Amino acid sequence: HHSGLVKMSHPSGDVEACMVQVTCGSMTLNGLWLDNTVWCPRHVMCPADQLSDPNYDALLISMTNHSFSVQKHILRVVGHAMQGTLLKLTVDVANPSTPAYTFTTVKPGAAFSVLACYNGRPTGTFTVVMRPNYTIKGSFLCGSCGSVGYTKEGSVINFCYMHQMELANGTHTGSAFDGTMYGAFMDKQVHQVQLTDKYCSVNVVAWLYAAILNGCAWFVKPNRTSVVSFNEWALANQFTEFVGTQSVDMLAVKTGVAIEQLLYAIQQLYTGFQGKQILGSTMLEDEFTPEDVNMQIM
Amino acid sequence: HHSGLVKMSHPSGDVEACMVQVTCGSMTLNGLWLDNTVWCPRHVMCPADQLSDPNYDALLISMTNHSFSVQKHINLRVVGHAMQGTLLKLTVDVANPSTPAYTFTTVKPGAAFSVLACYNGRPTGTFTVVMRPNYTIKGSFLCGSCGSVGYTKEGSVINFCYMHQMELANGTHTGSAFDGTMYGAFMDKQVHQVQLTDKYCSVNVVAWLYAAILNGCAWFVKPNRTSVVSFNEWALANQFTEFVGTQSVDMLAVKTGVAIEQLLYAIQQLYTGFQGKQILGSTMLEDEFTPEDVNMQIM
Ligand SMILES: *[C@H](O)[C@H](C[C@@H]1CCNC1=O)NC(=O)[C@H](CC(C)C)NC(=O)OC1CCC(F)(F)CC1
Ligand SMILES: *[C@H](O)[C@H](C[C@@H]1CCNC1=O)NC(=O)[C@H](CC(C)C)NC(=O)OC1CCC(F)(F)CC1
């Protein structure tokens, strides 16, 4: 039985309508056009020559509104400011199709949708999970900076990510819209090292619940590890503090397999699956959220 | 090292603007609005009771233009109605102002396409699937999802290729092409129907192994080769599809320097297990990434 648990993204149409190209002398990349404001990464100010140690404050000073060209494929610039790792460009035309939106900073374990763009043209969408080491996976090539990540609560779009860089290990990171870089990485072309990843406990729990709702509940025993103990246990086993949620609880009351049963399960299962499968996997999966499971097996 | 090889969908905006809701008495599901035409699954005509063998030829005659309500959320007047296989072709009196350039082409097994899952005319999610050789897809579809559509995009042209119709007992799904045929010849009757045996999509498996080589993980490549002809007759007896090359596979061979026939030999050896080794994080072969996927996502 295919559970129907898949990596599902939000319909991107709302966001497509905001994507623009931002050009500065010789660099080009994507930006996000909301009302009168175009957001893009500041390293568009930086020529290739000087990417390992750019002086962003001097670059900005050296700039004028006419340094920035903004074009829309899928506009005159009349203001320019810096906010952390991002540029805030004021343009004379407000985006009509600006959707209701907000800015949030997502925390490790949360999923969001990414609209990968190149040269202002949206080319692909996919879902990622913000790892505990504040990187994400996904697919980003040269020219993808400016691509944006978002959730939806309603028709309200919560913009959470603007893509900036690929680490040496092939994972990725970017800015939240307050201008800070997830995981404190620097926007410089300089070797930098991710912290060690961990497992998102809450997401593992939600996956084992899916398994139960799909009629694959063999791993379920009446042994129950208390929360704070599993927490202690995890600090030493590369696992995240487990925090319950209304979403998680809802899952226990549809399965009748309360959480702590599963925390215990995680311990015995972390060792190994001892010959058996869970939803066609022999390792634990942590990229499905409480919310995905409710939404997708309802 | 993270390949960057992930399940990627096309941006859905083009298709979101074509999605409507179609109502016929008690049945409600999604429809696709292109120019003056609204397409939707024909079992919207069927009352909940008659669904296990309905007489679609007589439901259709019993219907007038007023028997169908069509609402745009993301109301339209039906001025004609016709049946094309398992789908309805309704005419409405307003041309969709957001119709994208488009074609109707049926996909073959192993091809991937994007799905826009919709409930009551409202797009809720998008994901990518692979048409299996048993003519089923996986994905996520709930009560109300019928009429959700699957599509690719080449240039400015959307190719519409799927309109969702049903879930099978094993939890997989199927529907029809926009020429009206059902993939796999399943019927739009509410009866237990058994799907054919699955198989591995040899061309996609090759693509994945090229993807591994591009990611640096080439430990499985030997000089040894097995020829296309010779691979396909081995395939028949081992649950694999015929391998057919494409220009897309050829680019991967040219780029890596590894010939198709080396990877066909590797597939015969890796089928029985990896013996403790991994490939792109897997201990078994992946066949749901296409040559086109790999060229796009690694280049
Ligand atoms: C902006 O489009 C681009 C996105 C990168 C390019 C390849 N994949 C991506 O995600 N970002 C950069 O080019 C940045 C620029 C600095 C100023 C932030 N460079 C970058 O990511 O540097 C990486 C260091 C390690 C590496 F060599 F493996 C790849 C580039
Ligand atoms: C149309 O919206 C609906 C979509 C199904 C419902 C659950 N998941 C889906 O993808 N299609 C149907 O309900 C069809 C209708 C007939 C007339 C073609 N029937 C159907 O899929 O029934 C399934 C049989 C076995 C089952 F119970 F496991 C799931 C329902």
What DSSP string runs through A194-242?
PPPP-B-HHHHHHHHHHHHHTT--TT--S----HHHHHHHHHTTTBPPP
Asked if A130 and A108 touch (Cβ cutoff 8 Å), the reply is yes
* Orientation angle between helical segments A227-235 and A259-271, nearest 10 degrees: 30
Q: What whole-number distance in Å separates Cα of residue A294 and Cα of residue A251?
A: 7
Asked if A8 and A29 touch (Cβ cutoff 8 Å), the reply is no
Q: Is the CB of A42 under 6 A from ligand 1?
A: no
Residue type, A55: N
Q: What whole-number distance in Å separates Cα of residue A6 and Cα of residue A9?
A: 10
Whether A126 sits inside 8 A of B8 (CB atoms) is yes
Atom 13 of ligand 2: nearest residue by CA position: B166
Question: Both tokens of residue B218?
Answer: 């080439």
| Pairing state between β A101-103 and A156-166 | parallel
Separation of CA B40 and ligand 2 centre (Å): 15
Chain B closest CA to A138's CA: distance in Å?
6
Give the number of the ligand closest to the Cα of residue B193.
2
DSSP result, A8-77 = -B---HHHHTTEEEEEETTEEEEEEEETTEEEEEGGGGS-GGG-SS--HHHHHHT--GGGEEEE-----E
A130–chain B Cβ distance below 8 A for any pair: no
DSSP result, A153-165 = ETTEEEEEEEEEE
B108 DSSP assignment: P
Q: What is the resolution of this structure in A?
A: 2.3
Which residues have a Cβ under 8 Å from the Cβ of A275 and sit 6 or more positions away?
none
Asked if A164 and A85 touch (Cβ cutoff 8 Å), the reply is yes
Ligand 1 pocket: which of A19, A163, A172, A189 to mutate (most atoms <8 Å of CB)? A189
Q: What whole-number distance in Å separates Cα of residue A165 and Cα of residue A142?
A: 10
Asked if B215 and B255 touch (Cβ cutoff 8 Å), the reply is no
Residue A254 burial (10 A CB sphere; 0-12, 13-18, 19+): middle
Mutating which of A5, A7, A8 best tests the B interface, going by the most B Cβ atoms within 10 A? A8
Asked if A174 and A184 touch (Cβ cutoff 8 Å), the reply is no
Residue B27 burial (10 A CB sphere; 0-12, 13-18, 19+): middle
Q: What whole-number distance in Å separates Cα of residue A70 and Cα of residue A68?
A: 6
| Domain region containing B82 | 13-92
What kind and span of H or E run contains B64? none
β-bridge mates for residue A82, sequence order: A87
| Pairing state between β B112-119 and B37-41 | unpaired
Q: What is the dihedral of CA A162, A164, A168, A170, to 10 degrees?
A: 40
B185 DSSP assignment: G
| CATH number of domain containing B75 | 2.40.10.10
Residue B252 DSSP SS3: helix
Q: What whole-number distance in Å separates Cα of residue B24 and Cα of residue B19?
A: 17
Residue type, B196: L
Which residues have a Cβ under 8 Å from the Cβ of A260 and sit 6 or more positions away?
A224, A225, A226, A227, A230
DSSP result, A108-130 = TT-EEEEEEEETTEEEEEEEEE-
The residue with tokens 């991710």 is: A194
Q: How many residues does chain B have?
A: 299
Q: What whole-number distance in Å separates Cα of residue B260 and Cα of residue B226?
A: 9
| CATH number of domain containing A284 | 1.10.1840.10
Residue A142 DSSP SS3: coil
Q: Please indicate whether residue A145 is annotated as part of the active site.
A: yes
Rounded to whole angstroms, the maximal C-alpha distance in chain B is: 68
Give the angle subtended at the CA of B42 by the CAs of B37 and B44, to the nearest 5°. Answer: 100
Q: What whole-number distance in Å separates Cα of residue A30 and Cα of residue B32?
A: 31
Cα torsion A43, A47, A48, A54: sign: negative
On the CB side of A174, CA atoms within 13 Å amount to 29
